[PDB]
Each structure stands twice: as structure tokens, then as C-alpha cells.
């Protein structure tokens, strides 16, 4: 369980420890350099960097339209936003501010159905209330849709809270797939034929494999030590096919 | 976190060294102007008269030999002032100066405002005669750069 | 400090109440020595009467 958590946290959350001079400064217990590569969330922020305090829908649509203007087809401009639950409420209020500036049109309850009729013993005409804006359709084919992920709202890893409730990572918007690429943009790297290592260093008996008696002993102590090892990486080919929008209290 | 990372496929590699992928851009490009000189070699300032007043030669200096022997290139105003290149590029160091006449029936010349530094120029085509034609034009290419990641 | 960090960590990021969690344990490629460890938990109980 802990080795698989090491594999997921390295793949998602990795930082390249190579210096500006092309050197590695973190040296292991033998004295050789510890070489690490970027994660999912470091490879994806190099092109469409964005940070904010106040969420603006106009800046989100005018940054998804300036890179998809005449490059993506009119039916190829659906942009699904992966975010948290509190990023969905911040999106809902911002679309609600947008449709309240549309004073040309009258948003009547007969079509939006914000106040519904329900059956209840309290009254002959009992009412319900509630709505949420989950989609904005920008002009010229650009559609913006939310996809709330429980990965974002995780309160264990995400320690910086937001002043509007919840973690600050919930208020982060990432559009991982922009258009079709003709190939997989984001994938996970492995070596071919590389089985992840598993070895035992044991004395007179092995509790792990249940073996009593040892022809070839490691040490004289009554023990068994398991060593597990894996070499792994990730790849994002086109980081300009991916937009990010991060709360700036995460400090980049 | 593992549900998010299971939506990504897996490409298997041969070695544990760093890996590359070649990214590419287009081959069609516009080149800025550096300066423009008239037939005697003195540069066309902004406070100057028109330059090609009688289908007269003048010069267009570019920072790169991008244009060819007989092509019609146009300035920021496309098709209003067509510029037919006369002869190959004379290379003033890294700069390339082309002798240029006006093509589109223009009998009043190009304005001096239209021949300043920074105006981008773009290849349209290379026209010839119907009779006894000779070779004109050229072909442009593009090269990829690489990105990198490691394990 | 990994990640290529040259100029350090600020002092206000190292105060009392700062919470720390485990990412992973990266090793060198040649002659690496054993790192990382494994953790356990245990439950509780409750009670009632008449």
C-alpha cells in the first residue's frame, strides 16, 4: 500500500531536481546524485500558466478562445474543466454574475425552473427552490463544462485552506484535453521488460515468505528485510494542449 | 489520485535515459523590414516622398535572405502595393537587400510610410512572361526543436 | 531541499503548526541503500448500559 502511494505521489507530484546549470545537487547515501523528473502537475504548467485571486469568467473564455481560434474546429471546442467542489461554486457564482448582466434578456422562471412545485402536506401550493450554473457557452463554438473530481478536495495533502471554505486546491481549474491531438498527449512512462524489484534479506527464517531454514544466509540476525523498487515517469507531449488556472495562495 | 492516474495510457520505453520528442511549427512566414532605400541608395525616411513613382527600382533590406529571384511580395497592406523582386539578394553582411519595383499597375509609387522598419512582408507568387520565360522563385522549409523529460 | 532549489526555504514556512505529509522516497540509480518505511493503525471501542 505504501509503495503504491510512493508510485502515485511521484507520478502526479514530481519536481525536477536538475539545476539551471544542468547538474543534480541531491546526493544519495552512497554519494551519487539522486535524479528525479517532473510529475504530471509540473509538466503541465509550463505553457498555459495562470494564477488569480478573483475568478473571472471573461479571462477564462478569452484564454480558451485565443489558442483555439482558428486551430480547433467548431465542433472541437468543448473544454471540460476538472476542479473541486468549491471550484464549482466559484464557477456557479461567476456565470450567475454573467447572466445578471444580460439585461437585454429576461430570465423567467418558466424556463430556468429555479422555483419548482412540489407536493407536501403543509400547503396546497408548496414550492421548492434551487439551481446551479454548471456550463457557459462562449461564442463561436467554445463550450465550457465542469467535472468535479474528489481528487482536488483531498484535505490530507492539501493543507493551505481557502478563505471561502475548503482547501485552496478545490479552486483550481485544469483543462487537460484541448481538442484532439492525433496521439495520446498525457501518458505514463515505463521501461519494457522492467519488472519492479522485490528482494528479501533474511537470516535463519523468513516471516514474509513463510520459510523456515536458510541454505544461503544474509546475516546471522533473526530478521527479514523486504526491499521493493520501481523506476517510473510520466510524459506530457504538448503542454499547450492543456490550460491551468491556480489560486495564487498556493504560491505557484 | 489513483483514479485520476488510471485514465492515462502507458507507453513502454527501452532504456532509463532521458527521452525526446520533436515539436514543429509552420513553414510559411513573414519577415520584418529593416529599411528601404531608393535607387540612389539613401534610405526612405518617414517624412519622404513616394518611392516607385515611375515603375522605378528601389531597395528593400530584410534581416534574412527569405525571398527569391522573381517573386511578388507584399507589405502590411497586401495587394495594394505589390513588390516584384529584381534579381537575387545582395547580402550586406547578414542582411539581404533586394532591388524592387512596383507591380500592380502602380504609377504613383508606394508611400514613404509603407517602407519603414518592422513592417512584415509575405510571398505571394512568381510571375513570368508568356514568351521566352526564365526561372524564378524558391521553396522554403522548416525545422523541429525537441523537448525533454527523464525518470 | 529537492526540486532544484538553490536559495532555500523561507523561515515563515518552518513554524510551529506547519503540517508535513509523505510524498515518496527517491533513490539514486547506482548503489542505492534502503529507505522508506511502513506504518500501522488500530481502532477504538464504545459502550452502553441499561
Amino acid at each position: 500500500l505504501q509503495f503504491d502511494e510512493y508510485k502515485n505521489n511521484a507520478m502526479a507530484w514530481g519536481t525536477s531536481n536538475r539545476n539551471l546549470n544542468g547538474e543534480y545537487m541531491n546526493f544519495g547515501k552512497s554519494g551519487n546524485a539522486i535524479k528525479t523528473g517532473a510529475g504530471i502537475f509540473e509538466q503541465t504548467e509550463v505553457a498555459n500558466t495562470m494564477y488569480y485571486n478573483t475568478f473571472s469568467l471573461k479571462l477564462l473564455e478569452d484564454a480558451l478562445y485565443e489558442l483555439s481560434a482558428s486551430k480547433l474546429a467548431m465542433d472541437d471546442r468543448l473544454f471540460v474543466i476538472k476542479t473541486g467542489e468549491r471550484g464549482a461554486i466559484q464557477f456557479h457564482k461567476e456565470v450567475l454574475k454573467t447572466v445578471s448582466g444580460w439585461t437585454t434578456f429576461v430570465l423567467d422562471n418558466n424556463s430556468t425552473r429555479v422555483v419548482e412545485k412540489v407536493q407536501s402536506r403543509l400547503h396546497s401550493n408548496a414550492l421548492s427552490a434551487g439551481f446551479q450554473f454548471v456550463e457557459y457557452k462562449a461564442p463561436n463554438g467554445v463550450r465550457v463544462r465542469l467535472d468535479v473530481d474528489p481528487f482536488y478536495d483531498d484535505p490530507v495533502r492539501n493543507k493551505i485552506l481557502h478563505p471561502m471554505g475548503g482547501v485552496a486546491f478545490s479552486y483550481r481549474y485544469d483543462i487537460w484535453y484541448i481538442g484532439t491531438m492525433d496521439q495520446p498527449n498525457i501518458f505514463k512512462c515505463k521501461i519494457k521488460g522492467d519488472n519492479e524489484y522485490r528482494g528479501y534479506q533474511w537470516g535463519i527464517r523468513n516471516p514474509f515468505t513463510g520459510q523456515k531454514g536458510n541454505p544461503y544466509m544474509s546475516f546471522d540476525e533473526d530478521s527479514a528485510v523486504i526491499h521493493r523498487m520501481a523506476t517510473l515517469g510520466v510524459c506530457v507531449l504538448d503542454p499547450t494542449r492543456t490550460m491551468s488556472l491556480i489560486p495564487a495562495i498556493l504560491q505557484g | 489520485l489513483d483514479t485520476f492516474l488510471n485514465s492515462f495510457p502507458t507507453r513502454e520505453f527501452e532504456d532509463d535515459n532521458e527521452y525526446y520528442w520533436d515539436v514543429i511549427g509552420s513553414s510559411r512566414r513573414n519577415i520584418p523590414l529593416v529599411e528601404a532605400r531608393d535607387e540612389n541608395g539613401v534610405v526612405v525616411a518617414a517624412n519622404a516622398a513616394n518611392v516607385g513613382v515611375g515603375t522605378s527600382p528601389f531597395y528593400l533590406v530584410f534581416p534574412e535572405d527569405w525571398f527569391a529571384d522573381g517573386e511578388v511580395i507584399v507589405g502590411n497592406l497586401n495587394q495594394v502595393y505589390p513588390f516584384r523582386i529584381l534579381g537575387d539578394a545582395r547580402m550586406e553582411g547578414t542582411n539581404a537587400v533586394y532591388k524592387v519595383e512596383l507591380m500592380g499597375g502602380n504609377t504613383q509609387g508606394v508611400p514613404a510610410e509603407r517602407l519603414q522598419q518592422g513592417e512584415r512582408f509575405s510571398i505571394e507568387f512568381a510571375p513570368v512572361e508568356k514568351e521566352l520565360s526564365r526561372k524564378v522563385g524558391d521553396v522554403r522549409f522548416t525545422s523541429p526543436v525537441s523537448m525533454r523529460n527523464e525518470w | 531541499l529537492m526540486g532544484g532549489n538553490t536559495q532555500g526555504v523561507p523561515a515563515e514556512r518552518l513554524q510551529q503548526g506547519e503540517r508535513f505529509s509523505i510524498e515518496f522516497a527517491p533513490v539514486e540509480k547506482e548503489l542505492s541503500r534502503k529507505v522508506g518505511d511502513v506504518r500501522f493503525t488500530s481502532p477504538v471501542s464504545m459502550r452502553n448500559e441499561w
Binding site: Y197, G199, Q201, F219, M229, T231 | E14, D15, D16 | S32
Partner: peptide, 16 residues
């Protein structure tokens, strides 16, 4: 010298 093959990654914690 229990080297996990891969390409070349060499493990070093005692005899196994």
C-alpha cells in the same frame, strides 16, 4: 550487487 536489470540500476544493501 543485486542489480535490478531494467537498463542498469544497481541495488546495494547487503547480500540477499
Amino acid at each position: 550487487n543485486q542489480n535490478m536489470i531494467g537498463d542498469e540500476i544497481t541495488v546495494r544493501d547487503g547480500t540477499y
